[PDB]
Amino acid sequence: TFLEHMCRLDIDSPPITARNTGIICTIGPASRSVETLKEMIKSGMNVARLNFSHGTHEYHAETIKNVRTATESFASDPILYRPVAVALDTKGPEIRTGLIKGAEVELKKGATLKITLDNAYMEKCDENILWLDYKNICKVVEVGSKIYVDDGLISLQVKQKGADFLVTEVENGGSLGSKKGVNLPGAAVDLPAVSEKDIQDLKFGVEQDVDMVFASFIRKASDVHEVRKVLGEKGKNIKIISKIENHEGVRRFDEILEASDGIMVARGDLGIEIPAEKVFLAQKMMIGRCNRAGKPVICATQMLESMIKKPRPTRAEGSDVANAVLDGADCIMLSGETAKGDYPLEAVRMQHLIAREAEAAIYHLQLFEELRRLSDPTEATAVGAVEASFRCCSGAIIVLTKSGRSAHQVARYRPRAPIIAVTRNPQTARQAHLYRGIFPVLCKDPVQEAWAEDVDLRVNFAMNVGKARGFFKKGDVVIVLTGWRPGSGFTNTMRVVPVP
Amino acid sequence: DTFLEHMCRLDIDSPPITARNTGIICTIGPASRSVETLKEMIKSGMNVARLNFSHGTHEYHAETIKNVRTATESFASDPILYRPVAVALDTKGPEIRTGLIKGTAEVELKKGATLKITLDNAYMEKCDENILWLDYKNICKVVEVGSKIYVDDGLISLQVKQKGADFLVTEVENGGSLGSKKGVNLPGAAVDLPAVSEKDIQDLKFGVEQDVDMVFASFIRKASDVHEVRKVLGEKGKNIKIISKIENHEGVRRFDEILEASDGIMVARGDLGIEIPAEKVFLAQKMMIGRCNRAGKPVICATQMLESMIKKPRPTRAEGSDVANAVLDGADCIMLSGETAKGDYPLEAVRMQHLIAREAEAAIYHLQLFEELRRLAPDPTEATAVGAVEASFRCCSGAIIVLTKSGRSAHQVARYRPRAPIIAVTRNPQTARQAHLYRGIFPVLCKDPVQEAWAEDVDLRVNFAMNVGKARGFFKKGDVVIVLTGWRPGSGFTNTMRVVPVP
Amino acid sequence: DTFLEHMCRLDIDSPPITARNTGIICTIGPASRSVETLKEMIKSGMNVARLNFSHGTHEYHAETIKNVRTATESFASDPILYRPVAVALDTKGPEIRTGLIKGAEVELKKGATLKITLDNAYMEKCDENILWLDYKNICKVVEVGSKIYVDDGLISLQVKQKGADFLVTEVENGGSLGSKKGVNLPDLPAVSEKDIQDLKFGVEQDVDMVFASFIRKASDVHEVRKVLGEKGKNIKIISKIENHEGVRRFDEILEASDGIMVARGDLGIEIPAEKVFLAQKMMIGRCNRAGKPVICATQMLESMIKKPRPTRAEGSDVANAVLDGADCIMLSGETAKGDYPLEAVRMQHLIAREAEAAIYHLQLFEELRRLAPSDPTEATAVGAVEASFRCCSGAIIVLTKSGRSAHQVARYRPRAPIIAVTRNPQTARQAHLYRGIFPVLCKDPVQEAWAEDVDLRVNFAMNVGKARGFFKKGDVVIVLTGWRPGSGFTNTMRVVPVP
Amino acid sequence: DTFLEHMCRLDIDSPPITARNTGIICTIGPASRSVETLKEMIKSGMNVARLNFSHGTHEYHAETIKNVRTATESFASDPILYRPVAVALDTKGPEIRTGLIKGAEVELKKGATLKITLDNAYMEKCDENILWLDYKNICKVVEVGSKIYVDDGLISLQVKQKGADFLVTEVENGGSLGSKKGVNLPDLPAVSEKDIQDLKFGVEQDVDMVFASFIRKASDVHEVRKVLGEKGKNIKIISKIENHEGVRRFDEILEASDGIMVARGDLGIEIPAEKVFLAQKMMIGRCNRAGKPVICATQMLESMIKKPRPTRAEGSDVANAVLDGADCIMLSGETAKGDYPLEAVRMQHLIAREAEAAIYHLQLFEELRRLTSDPTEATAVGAVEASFRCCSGAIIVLTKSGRSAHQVARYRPRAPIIAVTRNPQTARQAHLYRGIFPVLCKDPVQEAWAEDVDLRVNFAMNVGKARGFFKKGDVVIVLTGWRPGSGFTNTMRVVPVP
Ligand SMILES: [K+]
Ligand SMILES: [K+]
Ligand SMILES: [K+]
Ligand SMILES: [K+]
């Protein structure tokens, strides 16, 4: 029972399980160097995120170079080599105010504010007529519609809508500077999914051979397909992860999920748009549907922010990170903790520890029996493999895959046993980190002419990796998923093999 | 139908429908001890008022208790709408405390700065940036060089650099604003203070005379600590519930024996974080809540709930998330501290707590709780309790109505955690107040005189329970309720279950 | 724990220590009419006395009923040990029978030629040449190659000439022909003139149930119901399914009836042998689902008509009927006219008790609990059976007036016996139709205080349960009652220790 | 969903669309001896031919075996439609019989007298008074008042006196005392000198299985095993449970046997009639639990010896045996000496097929599943799980000894198990297992292993399509090894039907 699982949790016993959730780290000035990156990889970093909200293409190109230099420095031993994915995080559409002749002119709880659109009234914002770059703001806003300014600092409330201006009352005021960020809860923002700057960044991402794109501010399915279109044919194999940052994204989550390769839950941005007594519900909902759909869900923002200045996180942060894992998140993303903080290596190590500790609180058998309660030969084989992995108490499930799909298919049923995905495709090896329980392995050996010899070679390689990682030892039993004939593109073959 | 589907169907646009089942415990202080404000807190959902005996005199607390009962009984004219309010005494216990600053504000401690700790009573009111006084006289022989000292709920951490015969020289590791009379923790040290001091005895006796409903025993490290508290309360306070506060590592280590000796448990997450690493505290919380749920004893989550509401009218998303997960872990009650005691928005804190708790109810997967609690569990009264919860799921009952004198039979039903609310009908004002400790129990106080005929008296109390249920929106005409009683008057045990239609 | 393991743990060397739960119905005749024999049959386990109204006058049957009640009430001195005995009237129905033979037995020789006359000039001079049967419109509904059966399907004939007057056949096979023997044609009135008289005689004699023969549709049951009328509205109607049409329209027959009797012997005449076991399983299944009694009859222990012990095939066939979910087993000639009626009853008791060891109770309930269609009484019924398993209770005690509440508990098939306590003598007798109900007749006067009267009846059930060995001091039992005097619900459940 | 719903859904006007999963064993005698008749019995559904060595000479049985094989191989020209037919040897065992009748039959009426003699001069003349039997030790195991049954329990006797070389009895139950009839007494050796010779003959005739009569204990089975020896080590030994001791010591017998035959008739004489059904259900359950074949025999369709159709009760008796969980049903006199041997086989086929509709397949499996680190066992379970999950038309198992097909069969999948083998003996022996449909592959071994696997699988595909098990578009489960000549059948493949 799940209750008994909680009762025998022991804080004095070390985590005997391996970490199954991926760790995504934002690379910046504090972690940009090869030497630091090497230690972060050793500490458990699986994906390197590039925040294109700031920095030039030159800067980021150097960062990508350093990440790959640090990564390939472990290639001298393919058994212990861990693939590292590169993630591009788009800037996305913003709503910014004008320049207060910078400086600030405070407001107060009661006064009025006449929002404008005069494209020359930029350089001088008062405590009355305020400017913003959102041209079509007057047809997606209503009367009574709140307008948060500077990350949920100053809330307004529309009173009069002309045709290209708004009269507002200041709900709660304070300091207000230049080029601040405004949020419109819960309006349907009509800004383009792909800014002209995003089109540049995404183009750059294709040339840099990035593995995935974190698309900011996704509100609908058509936004995702717009990013897809920009990536085009050349970037068709790049995984698109939609970032849910506002109320519309939550409401239209199903169409966004069906259009995406994965989901990022941005709690911080969510907390600005919707009340605090509901954000946890939205998180648990979105994670649940991603798990049900077998698509990767990333939990981001406000993970270990205190570790920017401290070597140790608060227990609240540790509890929040742990509960995200227990919710069913596939990956956890660090931001300023690794980008600009004083302890980037400690943050990665702490995230590893918390993820490992939360593993003990996971009730593996229940999740599978529910995901099974919810035709195709590959689906039956995947279910059969997981079922067999519980029956034999297997040390691992070895999946021979080209694109990664066969491994993802097994991963969606959440077996206790780690999934060793063996591939010769370096990209799918890197992209596999997005899925919980998948331990990607990159085979470098040339193809054998005899198909059964090539399979046996890939299996034995996985066998060696498993022994080295301590997943299993000789005498144990593993489940092996392959195809049947040379280049028949569907995994329908399950094999229960003793560990040699 | 499945836990996964249950999570998938969660909707933030949908208004929270079902009632709030977890208790709300509020610490009363300068910001909330007036009759006027107390009335608003009760309206907003306060079930239990906590008296913090770490501060204040007996006449101070007697006034608070009087104000609570005045505010509570102001609603007593309408027994259908009347909500019982419990009074909790939180003992001081083996505390170590600073340390009065000058002549009423604070000083700033900066990183890497030298700070001297003294035991010289000539400095007990002249503490500052350089010298600091505390009341633990044996501190120099329980602490070593390199020992960590935490001040004011772990806000400030110090490291001992030099051991003097009567003093300590420290270096500030974590800076901050030190105030007056703040708590001190010595994680690795073995503090010599007793579980029940002479001051605590005076306080517990005061609690008996003031007819408090429960005692929150601070810093419980073992079973014998609970037996001491139980002993002081004696025969006169034999019905006062004892809640043991787990605040350190030894308390977690010896949790099983403390739980068996106690009536309930309070998990102090904040104090726990001092001795236990951040990557392990959440495990400890889930463990203790689980064993409490298993034993059928109330568990309270306290400290670090809505602390930001001390200065802001709205909590952070992280706080609301942390509160909700405590409820989802299986906590029976949530306790508020500085939010209601001294903060600027005590009314807003209680309302937000009610709002978070109610929203969290939507994420609770009720049937699995019961199905597991029935399979892995250790009596006609017990079989009746299980059967009643069974029927409540089977019939989709609006409520389980339990006619109880001591509250026991209602507690036994609560252990199995039905989805339907448990309306405990009692004529005992004390068990009505104590019932708030248990999740899903909605205590109701019948003041009607005992009817001559027993069956007539039962129907009277059931009719009272159904009126309450209708008024609270638990059920309506045409619904079905489960009723638990004994057989014949003066019956020893509740072994009778009835399925009755709502007229 | 599982069904398979339950079968694996079966032990023929261990005494059947469970109580017999299936009702025993005995056909009373010249071999069992006497008060002495009836007394012993009651002691041996007879629950219901069946009177076959296909033969005998009302004078004869009134005497048989009187003897049954004399034997039954001879045990009334001890209310704790008194077992109620029901009386069943079995109608003749639309029977087609032959005529008497001149002198008397003749042999219908295999391959011969018979002539079915409809003229009353050969009704007393039948032989191997010309045969008479009491059916008129036989030449209005038949082809020239059909089959006709004699002596309960024993002899078979092949019609090869028609017209209107007679029928010319050929003996495919046969044996012996007595006189006025059963004839089968694989639209007589459902309730004939004679049936109406017998049914009204049944109301006058205060019989507990009626076994309606040859029910083919729901309107047949309604007609029987109509004849019984207001005076006999509480009399149970058990519809006998004896042909193919009864099987096809079984659903409407079941809904209209109070119970069902599966006549396997007659069923085999029309339906192929390879199909009858399926029909039996289907009908018993739908009866259990609907919560209505199903009786298995005919071809039970027929060998015991002349022998003191049955064959193993008969024991297996009876046991399987019980294991199929039958509520009652009916004996015919074994008790009516046979040389060992007392041994037949005892053997029936023996087999039914041994078969209980193979009953897997939990699965029956779990499936019924999941299949069953806000009623306080129905919810209490489920909860009581569920609590009986959980507490391993020795019995479920049900205080009932009409028997309905006890019937609702019986539907869920608890392993524990259901002690139905009643003051109504008829409900006590009719309760035997339901598997697992041990009816008990309280004769103590009504106490002034309702609660005290409930305690008295429960206490009476306690004493019966102890004397029967259902439970003992210290055990736990479930008790189902109403809440106040004149309650329309049996919605109150108690878990009470045995005093 | 529920067994109850499954029963309520039974419909007698709906034709049995499913195939017969239970094996049919037929006793061959003077009525079914000919090649022509045997051909019709094979087409009607006979899977196993039983030879009763209680009667007849070796050469008589040698000709029967030749005829059975001539009839079976007449269908060999079509590998896809060809059905393997097993040969079973049923030993005489420790049985005691009566002598010859002077005349011929004499009449023994209830309430008479009878002289049971050891006079060898009266083993030719056993009339109304005198009768001869071949058990010399008869006056050492029978008391005064002991009961004696003759000819399958037809006639019973009461011992009043105990003479020297004879007995004085009292006819308790009447009947017609025929000749060479069997006699029951509710110390003859487990295997006799005759049995030793008969078992040797069985090894020489290459029979597939031995029905060992009157097995009482484990040491009886191993005595038979030892006689069969090295040369007959692959011959299946099925122990016949015919008395109380066999039932009491059933576990040790089952653990020593390859299979079990439940002889209800012989059980009925020894054990009370109100207990035999319990014994039958217990033994079948334990065999199912152990994954060992159980045969229900005796008193099946006896009325079909003289009639073209069975009675209602016999149809219910056979059907309930199938529903009890019996792997095979055996016919005796109905096929051996009766007037309607062909009709007996066809009726047995019809009843077995009709009973199939009453089986809730998922219930048996879910119980057996929870009632291993061994890869072959895990693969076997997984294959059955997949067959339910995919609603597979069949489970194709490539097997050499049959062992792999057997462990899949233990879990009782709804889908037929197509056992593909090149070993003709395992093809014949596979008939003992419920749900196994054996096929004999005759294509020569291909050089490349993956090619030879595909050849065997495609053969199973064509058999399945010809039999109507499945059609193009459906999905089947396939169990194989991984490399040429391997120890474990540990490979499971979910493959579409071309
Ligand atoms: K960004
Ligand atoms: K305190
Ligand atoms: K009749
Ligand atoms: K034999």
Side-chain angles (χ1 to χ4, degrees), chain B residues 260-440:
Chain B
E260 191 276 337
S262 306
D263 299 310
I265 295 292
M266 172 177 298
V267 177
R269 300 107 50 79
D271 304 87
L272 251 23
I274 298 302
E275 269 168 42
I276 306 176
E279 71 275 18
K280 286 180 170 298
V281 172
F282 74 94
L283 290 172
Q285 168 174 314
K286 295 178 180 299
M287 179 271 285
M288 289 183 283
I289 291 180
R291 295 184 184 177
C292 286
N293 290 165
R294 214 229 268 109
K297 287 181 176 178
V299 54
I300 308 169
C301 286
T303 74
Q304 297 178 354
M305 302 305 303
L306 300 180
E307 307 278 20
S308 73
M309 293 199 65
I310 289 173
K311 292 171 177 294
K312 291 188 83 286
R314 224 170 296 100
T316 71
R317 76 95 214 155
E319 286 177 312
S321 175
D322 187 74
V323 177
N325 277 283
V327 170
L328 294 179
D329 282 340
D332 296 89
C333 290
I334 298 301
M335 195 192 86
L336 298 175
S337 298
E339 305 91 319
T340 52
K342 66 181 182 183
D344 295 329
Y345 305 92
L347 259 25
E348 288 76 3
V350 180
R351 289 166 182 166
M352 178 57 56
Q353 175 56 43
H354 169 84
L355 214 59
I356 298 173
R358 199 172 64 190
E359 288 280 5
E361 310 297 336
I364 293 179
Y365 190 55
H366 277 100
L367 203 35
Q368 174 177 119
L369 275 48
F370 167 62
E371 290 194 1
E372 294 189 4
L373 278 158
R374 179 188 45 176
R375 164 191 154 186
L376 253 295
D379 199 335
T381 316
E382 193 67 31
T384 300
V386 164
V389 175
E390 279 269 22
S392 74
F393 282 106
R394 182 181 306 119
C395 303
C396 301
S397 302
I400 301 179
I401 298 172
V402 181
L403 270 52
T404 179
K405 287 196 173 183
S406 68
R408 173 180 126 86
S409 62
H411 301 161
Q412 286 181 321
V413 177
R415 180 173 90 92
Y416 300 102
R417 315 274 271 213
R419 178 158 93 255
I422 304 165
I423 304 180
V425 182
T426 186
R427 284 189 167 99
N428 190 320
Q430 185 182 72
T431 87
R433 293 185 296 260
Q434 294 178 332
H436 286 307
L437 283 168
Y438 299 79
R439 174 201 162 78

Side-chain angles (χ1 to χ4, degrees), chain C residues 50-54 90-93 95 211 213 240:
Chain C
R50 180 183 79 111
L51 301 208
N52 188 6
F53 271 59
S54 291
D90 199 312
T91 69
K92 180 173 180 293
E95 278 188 353
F211 299 158
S213 298
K240 300 167 59 181

Side-chain angles (χ1 to χ4, degrees), chain A residues 7 278 315 357 366 370, chain B residues 3 280 291 304 359 368:
Chain A
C7 292
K278 291 183 177 299
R315 73 98 209 137
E357 288 285 6
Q366 176 191 177
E370 291 191 345
Chain B
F3 179 81
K280 286 180 170 298
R291 295 184 184 177
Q304 297 178 354
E359 288 280 5
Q368 174 177 119

Side-chain angles (χ1 to χ4, degrees), chain C residues 173-462:
Chain C
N173 73 281
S176 61
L177 177 57
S179 60
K180 290 198 175 303
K181 299 294 187 175
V183 173
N184 213 284
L185 310 181
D187 211 29
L188 255 356
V191 187
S192 59
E193 166 69 19
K194 181 187 181 304
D195 289 338
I196 295 181
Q197 296 166 339
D198 297 341
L199 286 174
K200 294 201 287 185
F201 176 76
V203 178
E204 284 166 1
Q205 290 288 324
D206 193 22
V207 301
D208 303 299
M209 64 196 67
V210 168
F211 299 158
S213 298
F214 299 91
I215 297 301
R216 303 176 183 180
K217 48 186 176 180
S219 61
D220 296 353
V221 185
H222 295 139
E223 286 187 354
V224 175
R225 185 82 66 187
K226 174 189 287 186
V227 174
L228 291 178
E230 191 73 11
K231 286 166 175 281
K233 65 189 307 174
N234 290 328
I235 299 178
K236 301 296 178 58
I237 302 182
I238 286 81
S239 295
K240 300 167 59 181
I241 306 300
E242 313 187 49
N243 51 71
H244 201 150
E245 195 193 349
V247 177
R248 298 185 184 182
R249 309 180 78 167
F250 175 81
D251 283 340
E252 70 171 30
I253 293 172
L254 175 61
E255 197 278 335
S257 304
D258 298 311
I260 293 294
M261 175 179 298
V262 182
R264 298 106 52 81
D266 304 274
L267 234 35
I269 302 181
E270 304 188 0
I271 287 91
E274 51 154 358
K275 260 101 149 57
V276 181
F277 79 93
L278 279 185
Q280 169 173 325
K281 281 178 150 55
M282 177 270 290
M283 288 184 288
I284 293 180
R286 294 182 185 173
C287 285
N288 297 156
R289 176 216 269 159
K292 288 181 175 178
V294 55
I295 306 168
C296 279
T298 73
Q299 298 179 350
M300 287 301 163
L301 300 174
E302 302 281 359
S303 73
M304 296 195 65
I305 284 179
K306 108 169 199 174
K307 286 177 290 183
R309 54 188 145 272
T311 59
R312 80 99 211 139
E314 289 176 329
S316 175
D317 178 70
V318 168
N320 277 318
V322 167
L323 293 176
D324 282 344
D327 292 86
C328 297
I329 300 293
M330 189 186 96
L331 300 183
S332 297
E334 308 94 307
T335 53
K337 62 177 70 174
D339 299 324
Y340 307 94
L342 182 55
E343 288 79 9
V345 177
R346 288 171 171 174
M347 180 53 58
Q348 175 54 41
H349 172 73
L350 231 170
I351 298 172
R353 211 161 94 102
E354 294 281 358
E356 286 298 318
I359 296 284
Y360 189 51
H361 287 97
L362 235 331
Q363 181 184 353
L364 273 52
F365 166 65
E366 183 188 274
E367 294 189 349
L368 281 158
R369 178 223 281 169
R370 181 176 173 85
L371 281 186
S374 62
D375 176 44
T377 300
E378 187 68 20
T380 302
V382 181
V385 178
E386 196 151 328
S388 72
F389 284 111
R390 186 184 293 98
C391 303
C392 294
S393 70
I396 299 178
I397 300 178
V398 185
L399 268 54
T400 181
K401 293 185 67 177
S402 71
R404 181 71 217 275
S405 56
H407 300 166
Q408 294 174 260
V409 176
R411 178 222 191 88
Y412 294 105
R413 295 285 191 264
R415 178 168 69 251
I418 302 163
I419 305 179
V421 186
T422 187
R423 284 194 169 98
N424 189 310
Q426 180 168 251
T427 62
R429 297 189 295 265
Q430 293 175 342
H432 285 304
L433 286 172
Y434 298 79
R435 176 209 163 84
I437 298 192
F438 189 86
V440 127
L441 182 56
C442 179
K443 287 202 153 305
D444 254 321
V446 182
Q447 305 304 99
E448 214 174 36
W450 172 84
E452 259 156 29
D453 189 76
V454 166
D455 291 345
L456 187 61
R457 282 174 288 169
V458 171
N459 225 268
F460 180 52
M462 295 291 186

Side-chain angles (χ1 to χ4, degrees), chain C residues 3 5 13 275 286 312, chain D residues 8 244 289 317 354 367:
Chain C
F3 175 82
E5 199 65 53
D13 294 321
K275 260 101 149 57
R286 294 182 185 173
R312 80 99 211 139
Chain D
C8 298
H244 182 261
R289 183 226 265 145
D317 195 305
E354 280 282 10
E367 292 200 339

